[PDB]
Every structure is written in C-alpha cells, then in structure tokens.
C-alpha cells in the first residue's frame, strides 16, 4: 500500500522518468504498473506474481 | 521475381487485421473491469 494505492506484486527498480508532479504510472488499458516511494522518491515497477 | 519486393514493401493486410482484431478484443475485455454494472463501486476494497 503506497498512500492509498492498494495492490499485490513484486517491486523492482524501474527505468521510467515521471514528471516532477506525478506519483504513479499506468500502462495501456489503464492498470497501475509503477509507483514512486513517498519517502525515497524512487520509481519502482510492479510486476504480477 | 525481382519486382515482388517492391510490391510488398510499398500489402499484408490480411495478416495484420487478424492480429489487430484479436488484440482489440482482449483489450476490450480488460476495460470491463472498471465498470459498476449497477453497483455502488467497482473495487472490492470498497
């Protein structure tokens, strides 16, 4: 759970670059696939188990 | 035979349509997971 974003999956270092106001990203078909850690400000991918 | 390459490079619509049509149906299936269908919400955590 990332400040409201509830989900399940494996967290890994990403290679995306958000804009300096965006918290999380979605893929095509509108499903969350990356988030930013509120504390460390790093982008992490979310892959299904 | 040397002209075939021009006719194809400038054609594979029958193969592209079947791949694209199936992908559009699969994406349409996923887009149904964000509808209420006559409920208070679409999210089980609510």
């Amino acid at each position: 759970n990332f400040n409201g974003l509830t989900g399940t999956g494996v967290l890994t270092e990403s290679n995306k670059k958000f804009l300096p106001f965006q918290q999380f990203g979605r893929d095509i078909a509108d499903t969350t696939d990356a988030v930013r850690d509120p504390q460390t400000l790093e982008i992490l991918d979310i892959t299904p188990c | 035979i040397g002209k075939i390459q021009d006719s194809l490079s400038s054609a594979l619509g029958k193969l592209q349509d079947v791949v694209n049509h199936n992908a559009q149906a699969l994406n349409t299936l996923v887009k149904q997971l964000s509808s209420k269908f006559g409920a208070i919400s679409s999210v089980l955590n609510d």
């Binding site: 078909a29 499903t31 299904p48 | 699969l26 299936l29 996923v30 997971l33």
Partner: peptide, 29 residues
C-alpha cells in the same frame, strides 16, 4: 501480463516452418 490472462506459445517455431518451406522448395526445383 495482468490478471489471469496468458498467451500460449506455438508448437512449431519459426525455424521449423522455414524447414518445411525449404523442403518443399528443394523438392519441386
């Protein structure tokens, strides 16, 4: 990729299909 949706690979690889077509081509010529 997602929730409960998967894609199964074909039994025949693209290399195996090329082998079938080269055998037909070598036979007829």
């Amino acid at each position: 990729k997602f929730n409960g949706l998967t894609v199964l690979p074909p039994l025949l690889t693209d290399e195996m299909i090329a082998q079938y077509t080269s055998a037909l081509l070598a036979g007829t010529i």
